[PDB]
RNA sequence: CCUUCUCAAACAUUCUGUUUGGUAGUGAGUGAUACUCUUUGGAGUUAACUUGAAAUUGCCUUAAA
């Protein structure tokens, strides 16, 4: 048997969750659609999972989009066996760096840097390379 | 009576072509018939037989008014 | 009913695949009589008063296409499904399969003729393509293979 | 309704994302320029591009002097849905309907909006003769509830409408619009901007070819720079 | 400036390390031969991660030895020129060769933004074409469009990323401007990126390149420019992840944190 | 017999691009648009020279 | 099945030289040990390489009808 969950790959760039929901909403009703995305960057990975309320809608979508060509990408859609419920898929967005580690006093980190430089000199001496300062 | 076809011959793809037929130079060389036609048109233009397209445009621009 | 070789046609490509194939083919329309004539006249005029690369066009002649096939030069072949002398095209699919050249069956010979400035073209094939469309050509070949050989793997069976 | 395919949806989404990125970048650059933090930007001085027939490109800077401009809707890009940022600007000028055009006063505060709505519309400075012809050929006056949009017909109607500022005839409105008059803002809003007829306005054998030729010429004549410091493109509105 | 004795000692130690007591040169010929200097700073250009390249002035850039010594290698050094569509027609390969053959430098190919978006659109083809060239020169106008057309993979390395080159004189395109700017870049500059991070690295080339004394002079010149540019920090001369050799020690920068 | 003006001009380019090195002329892509053999090129060059300096 | 942010100034005006500014990207995978950082949990930098645009889940309406 097959479940309502569907796995779709080879998604063209920019084919986000909203577009998938709008396109697949014609085939009955879709329970939920999720698209894989990277953590550091919000762009999708070109593959996601969508669930259908009824198995007939899922099979119809799979048949229609089995090898559909979409602007240079031939979409491949598979119907998972019975069960195999979709797992979590966070809606990752662009990550912007935030600076927090400047609380230490400058005087303390000065001595820390001096000690680190001395340790580095000792280490490079231990590695078989003779050097000073 | 009614049975599916069998690919006994088509099962294995043909790795090599059928006939060598060494390629002629014309395939790797610009067309000679086009050159002959161009030379014929040049001769016609020189003989005052074919009006060059630019000359036709110039004449028509004066005309129609 | 009809023998397995007959009814192999009419199992054409889907709407999207056929549309994409025709869109790709429309970028390589051979120059019509007027276009070639004007180009030749311009060349003559330039020569009168005083190095182009190989032109790219779709090969469509039945004899020319058949010659291109069996030499593995052709990459994609389009076959009309409404050829009145069916014997002229019955052997084309099997010959292409034996030679391994990707092939497809399209609806209507007039559609093939339109993209080659002809009333009716029995077949339309591509030999060489520009580097820009090479990736597109490979993608179309893969899509056609997936939609024809696997989807219609029984096209050569069940009379 | 009719089935919607995936190709159109994907194309629309990509075009909308590109337009949104362009608008965000342009707005951010303009806001920084207004703040006078011009230390690190591509360009600070404004630029206006004039394209005319063969085609000749002229690049000129924008000064603070007021100027008269005419804007006409273009209905482009093809697969770009108007974003909210541009939607608000279009609604403020009530130019949503295609082929619609109105007269606005060129000012520094209006340059960012013109840049934002640059691809959607075509702008330029019409001559006095063109303005007079446009005003005297088309017009609308809202008449009494007032669900009627009857075309301008009588001079006495002009007296009834405004009256106070000496606007007693269509020529008064023409002078106020062409010249930098005090009532330029008031008359323009009440003028119910014109609904210019479409170019081809036909369909058929010859009409299809003419429309195809016009579309081909439009791409060459009009371009979408999409640059952050894209100069405002101006064409000869007098021809239209 | 830092004494030249320390740099001499560091280069001598690198020379000793390069030699130590399975046919092709997989990674060995590049691991113990590459010369680079690591410069530390307080979040180099932390405001934004721009892909701007800084062309450090060098009396004897590695480009000439790189071309000279690139003959005996599988990878062949090449120069890529990218110009706007309008000016590509005016630019001629024969003229470029004639005006550049005297100096000895050559241009392998000339490309335009139109080509990148049509023939090199494919990711595989784009990667194959970009990887061929080691030096990339792009017209100042088209550098902003290049990242979108050429993707981000080419920017993962200093060699692949484009380098801005001036080609306009009096606001009008001038052949001589490009002709001499390419020469200046080739034999009078050293590109280097400005990463959005504390660490900064400059690739000085292989060890067999410009003589150690010339290498020391180049290191001193680069260090002077870096000091005059940013509030840099401890600097080390390093081979491929080999033991670091400190060269400069900045302390006033810490108090400014 | 005589050589055409275009043929004479092309032979002049071959001459004052390579001179007498027919081997180099055989690989001259710009001038040798038609990949003619070395013998034909040398024969044409000799014929042109016989009627010129 | 739409195409991609194709330059702006100061000096010098030898007709191009000096200085500045504008460049936020398909993803996945492999991988050579240094920088700081806050002390903890890893945040940003640092060689090199494979890829069919490959991939199994990181907690406005005349391209109208």
Author numbering:
A (entry chain o): 88 to 220
B (entry chain m): 239 to 303
C (entry chain G): 70 to 119, 125 to 233
D (entry chain t): 53 to 105, 127 to 217, 222 to 317
E (entry chain K): 31 to 51, 66 to 301
F (entry chain v): 175 to 227
Paper passage:
To further decipher mechanisms of such an intrinsic quality control pathway we analysed here the contribution of three yeast large ribosomal subunit r-proteins rpL2 (uL2), rpL25 (uL23) and rpL34 (eL34) for intermediate nuclear subunit folding steps. Nog1 is part of a range of intermediate nuclear to early cytoplasmic LSU precursor populations and its association with LSU precursors was previously found to be independent of the ongoing expression of rpL2, rpL25 or rpL34.
Again, two major folding states, Nog1TAP_L25-A and Nog1TAP_L25-B, were detected in Nog1-TAP samples purified from cells where expression of rpL25 was shut down (see S4 Movie for an animated overview). Hence, their overall fold again closely resembled the one of the low-populated Nog1TAP-F state of the control sample. Only minor displacements of rpL25 main contact sites in LSU rRNA domain I (helices 9 and 10) were observed when compared with states of the control sample showing clear rpL25 densities. The factor and r-protein composition of state Nog1TAP_L25-B largely resembled the one observed in state Nog1TAP-F. On the other hand, in state Nog1TAP_L25-A several factors binding to LSU rRNA domains I and II and the ES7 element could not be detected (Ebp2, Brx1, Rpf1, Nsa1, Rrp1, Mak16) (compare Figures K and L in S1 Appendix). In summary these structural studies indicated that both rpL25 and rpL34 have a crucial role for the stable positioning of LSU rRNA domain III in nuclear LSU precursors.
